[PDB]
Design a binder for this molecule. Structure first.
Ligand code: A2D
Ligand code: A2D
Ligand code: A2D
Ligand code: A2D
Lengths: 255, 255, 255, 255
């Protein structure tokens, strides 16, 4: 199979990458970073996010694996040799996670694996929240976060969001510091949306917004609409062993 | 069709019930509170919850309707005559919401439409939380709440839980006042579970618990396990017009 | 000086108590549990709370010390011999913390070192909150917690309350699961009150309440009013070394 | 007395200002915007904040009044004529609120009436929190907010902070979206500090920060320290009638 490996680019990670490549040499099994079927990320979750965004045009063709030197890792660096063999022998089943589609109209389209957020350029942030064409609330505050299920353990979590099992095809919207008084009113609760529901943000003033997709953060000017929906596209993971999401959550947050 | 009507038992509600019955007399269309196909609740959400729990053995056979004199209402009292006609002419499609199965072992089984909660008899509350047989956390605090999607606007909401669209077959667990220090540790985030996931609570001490299912609240003694899962059974609603969940949420919480 | 020692009543604690007594025998320095000037608590914070409530009629005359076998401890069990000597030689300055006065009218009066809470007998909990005779809010939910500054790290903390330095003569009110919708409305924010401010809770229905003061929890019947204020009385601590509150908070919650 | 009036600069406010000036003409009572003893703000709380920051070198000499066309207002526009007379006849007592001193070292010093916040230039935000020279926590997240007591109803409130009566000489620190896992740990609770306590923020990386003081927001480069403390300076308000803080809180947030 075609494969490539990204590295966090530090010493531990580069050396681990070279050893896996060498191990892969003993199978066939060729390195190709243009059209891989297997993408291996060595480093952290940021490294993994970058790997995802590198090959986002090829998501249907790729199975991703992460090594942590991690919610998208998965393998310790000492398990690397076992990973080469198992991966060479094709001894793996695939799991798929949902992604979030962001549409920015003035049309630009983005995929997130963790989340997309909106803040103002600075700037009070005021937007109208429209769910399935129905006007839901006028949001005043610092911003909004829209999360995939695997993204729920990330920024969403820090915002008081729920953690969702990634087999649920949904997206979750959280508030950042909303103003609520006798005048101004938001739901003040995370909102979880099914597939096919469309959350639309529309400017009240003030059409400039700092929009983030996972790590990428760009100021968009003269925005008419930001549109959120569960993507029809999914990321596919290779594995290999049972490592349940709730165990992964336990390992990262409890002990 | 067979039908019955429950009333909040105040003047407005009893009189509205008698008028609908009289209106129903002009169709056929017979009153039967043993095996109705249509159950009409007049009053509040508590009235509706009682109606549900009255006919919980017959959920596959019944379409419920609520009039509010409401998340399970739905119809204003002035719309009652239009409801009789529409209901008589069979001019309705059915919508289904998920329910939560609670199992209490010492085995007792309960269905909730809103939620089931666990507290101690008083009593520090300490339980071990086991997800799909994996030990997740030892919870110390006031108690736990497990919510259906339509229950998310209720007790769940007051506990910092997310609001979930009821087309998502899931249940959501929230904490009540958890102790967290350098010793004791909980996830401190709502958890959203798919169908087939099983959340199990097991006593650490101390096997007496005040367990609630919607409005019903009973002290269970010598408990070995409380077990939560998305029920295979669903409640069915009759309607009639578009009244979207997110609109319903807006109407109840925003304006 | 007159002194006494309470023990958690387990093996470690009883034995540590007997050794301190023996060490105290070498000074003068007599044991008296009727009118001590020094009260030593060995065990946990619960042991310390009990010690406080044992001698609450004598707070102006007593300096308390805690050994943890702890926010009210303070000394490790290995430091006990150094504590005997230092305490014998009178090598200590006193620090005072504020307390909360609870008044229950039908009049009963209680002092809390941590907090006093109000819930219903079960029972929806609904009370009118009156600050300095002004009607502030109608509270609907599970209950309310009123905390001293040293109590802020306890139950208050689990309820989303702020941690306050105990040199501030104040009390803090937190909500337990308040209902908020378009109908029902609470402040949904902890409230911090100065000395001389009076928070009054008054029944709406329904005059039975489960009222807690620190560990003690009793059902009060036919309540007309619960009244909260910063007590004129203060607890006095003996010490001995610098152990700053914020360090104590760090040690208990961070690392 | 010397006096001046600032206006929100819209029609209602400018016209109300001219009428008060004319009313003041009938007393003596001269307009002076260089050294006023009375500063009247007409508009909103932003107008009032600007008025405060205009005359921050003269706080000991000035009594501020706000008209709202408001937590710092206070007077409705229809009450303006009564305000002129009462203010002319000197029929007022003064109330003082605490302020927050911010020190930025590379030394720049700022006063806030609401709050000062710190975020990164963008930029992960990581700082070490040092209370009275003791290292308390390493904060990772979006930023931190330090609030005066009258500022607690503002940005602090939206961040889950407590509302404090402004007679309490204190400052309150809240978190913006902190990361907490098994690795990274913050207190995750607002912290309330007495007068003379010093909260120090120190860079970990990364010495550029967006620092806000009330409305003003500037990027500071090559920061070594941000230092917070209750200011020795206080704002003085003129009034006139009883309008208690808790009533003001009720009027703005409940009904
Ligand atoms: N799915 C998931 N679950 C749990 N933990 C995760 C996850 N993904 C990344 N992370 C962790 O987030 C932590 C901080 O993010 P980091 O600095 O790694 O960001 P990246 O460039 O990779 O990439 C930026 C990411 O950080 C997230 N982020 C950005 N700001 C915050 C704050 N303030 N709190 C929490 N998360 C944030 C942002 O959404 C992106 O997800 C880091 O320790 C990662 O291990
Ligand atoms: N699905 C849904 N969405 C939004 N609002 C709803 C819903 N169901 C009931 N309610 C409302 O809850 C409010 C309080 O409940 P109520 O006293 O009606 O309780 P019931 O006997 O019907 O029945 C007891 C119910 O109240 C819930 N409950 C109990 N205690 C609380 C607190 N403290 N906060 C919020 N909800 C609570 C409990 O779970 C049961 O759901 C009331 O105004 C209802 O209109
Ligand atoms: N001042 C202070 N700061 C930090 N930690 C403290 C403090 N005082 C006690 N504790 C700790 O609270 C923990 C639980 O309380 P525990 O069971 O010790 O209660 P006690 O009988 O002593 O006594 C009952 C106490 O527990 C508090 N309590 C009761 N329920 C809760 C919940 N659900 N969360 C947090 N605290 C609670 C209650 O207010 C009383 O303060 C325990 O680990 C203590 O070390
Ligand atoms: N003391 C107090 N209590 C209650 N409400 C108040 C107070 N002061 C201002 N406000 C209100 O804050 C609201 C938003 O602030 P606005 O846009 O007025 O800001 P300003 O330029 O005056 O000035 C900027 C101010 O807004 C605050 N602010 C900035 N962002 C937020 C968010 N996201 N939530 C809440 N407050 C914020 C910031 O700290 C400054 O205090 C506005 O409706 C004011 O009436």
């Amino acid at each position: 199979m075609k494969y490539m490996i990204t590295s966090k680019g530090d010493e531990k990670s580069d050396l681990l990458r070279l050893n896996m490549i060498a191990g892969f040499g003993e199978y066939d099994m060729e390195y190709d970073d243009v059209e891989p079927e297997i993408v291996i990320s060595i480093g952290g979750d940021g490294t993994f996010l970058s790997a995802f965004h590198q090959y986002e045009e090829r998501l249907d063709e790729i199975a991703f694996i992460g090594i942590h030197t991690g919610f998208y890792a998965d393998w310790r660096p000492a398990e690397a040799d076992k990973l080469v063999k198992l991966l060479a022998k094709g001894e793996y089943q695939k799991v798929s996670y949902p992604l979030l589609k962001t549409t920015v109209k003035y049309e630009a389209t983005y995929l997130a694996l963790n989340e997309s957020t909106v803040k103002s350029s600075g700037g009070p942030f005021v937007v109208d929240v429209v769910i399935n064409d129905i006007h839901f609330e006028r949001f005043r505050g610092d911003g909004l976060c829209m999360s995939t299920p695997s993204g729920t353990t990330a920024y969403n979590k820090s915002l008081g969001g729920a953690l969702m099992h990634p087999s649920i095809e949904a997206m979750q919207l959280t508030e950042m510091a909303s103003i609520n008084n006798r005048v101004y009113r938001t739901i003040g609760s995370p909102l979880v949306f099914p597939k096919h529901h469309v959350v639309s943000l529309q400017p009240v003033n003030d059409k400039d917004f700092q929009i983030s997709v996972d790590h990428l953060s760009i100021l968009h000017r003269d925005v008419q609409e930001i549109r959120y929906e569960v993507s029809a596209k999914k990321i596919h993971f290779a594995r290999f062993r049972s490592f349940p999401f709730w165990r992964r959550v336990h390992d990262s947050f409890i002990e």
